[PDB]
Amino acid sequence: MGYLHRVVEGLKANAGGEALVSADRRLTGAETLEEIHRTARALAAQGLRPGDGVVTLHGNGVEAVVLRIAVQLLGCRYAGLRPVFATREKANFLAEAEAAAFVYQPDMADEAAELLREVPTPRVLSLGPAPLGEDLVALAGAQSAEPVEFTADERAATAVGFTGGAKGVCRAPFDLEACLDASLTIFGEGPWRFLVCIPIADLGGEMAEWTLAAGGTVVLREDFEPADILATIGAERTTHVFCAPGWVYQLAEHPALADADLSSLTQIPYGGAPSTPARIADALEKLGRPLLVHCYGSQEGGWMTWLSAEDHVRADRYLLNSVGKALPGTEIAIRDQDGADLPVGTVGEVCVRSTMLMRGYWRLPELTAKTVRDGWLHTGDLGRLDTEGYLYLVDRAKDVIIVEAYNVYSQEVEHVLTGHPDVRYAAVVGVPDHDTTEAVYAAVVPAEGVGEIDVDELRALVRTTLGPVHEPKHLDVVDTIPTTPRGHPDKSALRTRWRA
Ligand SMILES: Nc1ncnc2c1ncn2[C@@H]1O[C@H](COP(=O)(O)CP(=O)(O)OP(=O)(O)O)[C@@H](O)[C@H]1O
């Protein structure tokens, strides 16, 4: 009965219990709810009204979550810059935003001034003592904690999340409550004790709101470092920590895992980037129980599928190369070049329809209309369904390797390679071929205790599984697979390195 209603009621149900725990500060539900009201009235006092854009620049402090909710409670449009983003990318976003306020962490006051010289914004605000603008925690300090009722259009965008090259995904309460609803399906009923070490600016902050909504406790960390995270799980008695798949491996392999206490976890949901099945298998063996839950989502589509914990260890199937089944209410069609629905089993673009679809891309109505067509999000992912409804991603459309007019799917070839015991990690990419236009390059990282990889054994296994053309013409053993700023392997830089 309204997205912020859901958040607030969650905080009212957790009034006396912890709600926001960072390493610096701890609020109850009642304390948390009080800061939100006072922050919201403070922002209102500064002139912000429904529809006004509030760009922010902060880490994952407590103050960041109160800010996100308070801005949205007013009905304003929260637009959170990740810290990780290059400063130029931030400016371009801040400029694109019809920004009515800019709210920054003191710690980051340098960057604030570079961006604000570059985009003069009114209502510069600081989350504590700071060189620039007024101090918002002070302003809230002197404000009443009287509840502020959400009264804006549930359908109008209250959040914008940035995705690089470089786009803001707008979200309204409507689609956010549906995202909330899906989270309860994935993560189970609340209350959760949820370890968020993802930016509050974007996905970490929605996950914060979901946790609170379901009446739970957000445990904030700035980022993922496996040793801190293992300590935090036991100390803060976490029920969930959302991981990039690499992070999952870092936990499961970390020497201090043996001394850590993980008994509090119900789940370790993971997603955001392609997993290595064999590695998820090892993580599963090393953790000792079905904790892992595979989540497939996008900022545009919200949650699309999840592979449950039980399906990770289902006796009669191997499903670790699946991102699982549709969430209740999510329809999935697999479509060809022209938008024809393909029969179950065939490869095509994953197109999803649900009430979780974004409101659309910020100030990009053309691109919106190319991406969402007749209420169907075209994901740019390629995959197939199976007769039990599991989704298998084989490639991003942009990564497909065209050899002699046949389609080689890079992600699908990696899984074959990584499935090999001698291979730990792999990246497949297309490079120029005189004869076949594009040939298949695979870089493979050897497992521990593997010496010389038999590159012919590996080509055979791909031929034998996918067929001849899927065979890597070029097969480098490497130390390391380069990575992009945002959890994802750097395919450009392998294309780039392979020429020279
Ligand atoms: N569990 C999973 N397994 C494989 N690919 C996944 C995945 N979850 C997400 N993806 C991939 O990553 C996409 C999700 O990206 P978005 O949420 O839109 C931006 P992002 O990956 O966070 O990058 P950004 O740094 O530009 O924000 C999907 O459309 C799909 O290609």
Side-chain angles (χ1 to χ4, degrees), residues 2-87 90-113 115-148 150-224 226-258 260-284 286-309 311-358 360-369 371-397 399-485 487-496 498-500:
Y3 178 58
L4 278 120
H5 167 265
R6 285 291 288 290
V7 166
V8 155
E9 288 332 297
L11 286 166
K12 280 172 164 203
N14 193 21
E18 302 195 307
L20 299 178
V21 158
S22 73
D24 312 313
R25 204 160 66 113
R26 282 189 189 283
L27 275 19
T28 68
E31 277 159 359
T32 296
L33 189 40
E34 280 177 65
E35 308 255 56
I36 290 162
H37 293 316
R38 85 198 342 135
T39 303
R41 293 179 177 291
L43 295 166
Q46 279 280 305
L48 292 166
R49 295 287 169 282
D52 290 325
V54 182
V55 173
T56 85
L57 169 61
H58 48 57
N60 299 348
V62 155
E63 307 79 13
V65 185
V66 167
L67 175 71
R68 197 179 158 94
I69 296 148
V71 163
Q72 291 179 265
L73 184 56
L74 288 186
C76 299
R77 173 177 53 80
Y78 177 92
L81 301 173
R82 275 217 181 69
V84 90
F85 282 166
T87 299
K90 291 198 183 80
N92 270 349
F93 286 142
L94 170 58
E96 281 172 50
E98 284 133 44
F102 176 83
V103 189
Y104 71 99
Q105 186 167 301
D107 218 14
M108 295 179 178
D110 280 358
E111 193 161 7
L115 298 167
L116 276 166
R117 134 142 7 255
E118 206 76 0
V119 192
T121 308
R123 307 171 180 104
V124 172
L125 288 169
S126 46
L127 275 354
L132 251 152
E134 296 178 60
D135 180 2
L136 174 61
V137 316
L139 289 173
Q143 206 87 22
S144 98
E146 213 67 65
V148 177
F150 180 83
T151 53
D153 169 19
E154 190 72 359
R155 195 70 59 131
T158 61
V160 175
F162 292 113
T163 81
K167 15 180 266 282
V169 171
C170 298
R171 278 192 168 286
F174 175 72
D175 56 78
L176 279 168
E177 178 181 14
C179 282
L180 162 58
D181 289 340
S183 312
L184 286 163
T185 299
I186 300 181
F187 307 148
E189 276 306 305
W192 316 311
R193 283 197 61 93
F194 205 110
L195 203 180
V196 179
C197 61
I198 286 168
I200 297 318
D202 41 284
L203 170 62
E206 278 148 350
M207 273 178 195
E209 304 153 355
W210 308 327
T211 298
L212 295 174
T217 298
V218 183
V219 181
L220 297 156
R221 294 287 185 255
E222 293 298 315
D223 54 60
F224 180 85
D228 167 69
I229 292 286
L230 290 164
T232 302
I233 287 157
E236 298 297 345
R237 233 63 180 78
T238 75
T239 61
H240 300 72
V241 44
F242 201 96
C243 297
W247 302 359
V248 173
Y249 324 146
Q250 292 180 65
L251 291 175
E253 289 173 1
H254 188 96
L257 166 77
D261 187 13
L262 261 50
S263 56
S264 56
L265 288 165
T266 54
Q267 291 194 339
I268 301 179
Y270 65 104
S275 56
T276 306
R279 301 293 71 69
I280 291 296
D282 286 344
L284 221 39
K286 279 152 190 288
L287 291 171
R289 45 180 207 124
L291 276 190
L292 296 189
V293 179
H294 198 185
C295 305
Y296 167 61
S298 55
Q299 293 209 199
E300 299 102 327
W303 297 127
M304 297 183 277
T305 71
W306 97 111
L307 191 65
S308 77
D311 278 346
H312 280 71
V313 302
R314 189 166 163 204
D316 61 323
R317 305 271 192 278
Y318 196 67
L319 279 171
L320 289 191
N321 68 328
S322 185
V323 292
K325 296 181 194 174
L327 273 103
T330 297
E331 297 165 280
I332 297 171
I334 301 301
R335 296 181 170 154
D336 68 12
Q337 263 61 19
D338 300 310
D341 283 6
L342 297 175
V344 173
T346 323
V347 163
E349 188 182 23
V350 172
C351 308
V352 317
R353 184 166 68 195
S354 76
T355 59
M356 286 179 259
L357 274 8
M358 54 170 181
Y361 290 126
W362 177 250
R363 296 269 174 290
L364 293 175
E366 299 78 359
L367 184 70
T368 296
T371 292
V372 183
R373 317 194 210 109
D374 205 53
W376 285 96
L377 168 66
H378 285 71
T379 59
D381 301 317
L382 302 192
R384 64 194 145 241
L385 292 157
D386 76 6
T387 62
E388 302 171 287
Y390 292 98
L391 175 52
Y392 302 78
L393 292 193
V394 302
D395 233 346
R396 279 193 296 129
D399 298 351
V400 168
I401 301 165
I402 305 206
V403 185
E404 304 178 57
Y406 301 123
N407 286 345
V408 175
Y409 299 117
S410 67
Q411 222 168 101
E412 172 165 71
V413 173
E414 296 174 22
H415 292 157
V416 173
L417 290 172
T418 59
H420 201 267
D422 291 349
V423 170
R424 169 172 199 179
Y425 302 125
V428 171
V429 91
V431 299
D433 200 80
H434 224 115
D435 293 351
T436 82
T437 299
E438 258 185 296
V440 176
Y441 175 64
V444 294
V445 166
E448 62 189 44
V450 177
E452 201 192 327
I453 300 195
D454 183 355
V455 297
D456 284 316
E457 201 196 351
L458 263 48
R459 282 181 179 115
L461 179 73
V462 182
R463 181 163 62 243
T464 267
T465 304
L466 302 194
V469 284
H470 299 98
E471 190 169 317
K473 191 182 164 82
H474 319 297
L475 212 162
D476 273 8
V477 170
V478 297
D479 47 339
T480 191
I481 282 154
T483 18
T484 77
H488 253 99
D490 190 353
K491 294 213 177 159
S492 290
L494 287 170
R495 280 179 279 248
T496 308
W498 176 81
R499 280 143 193 181

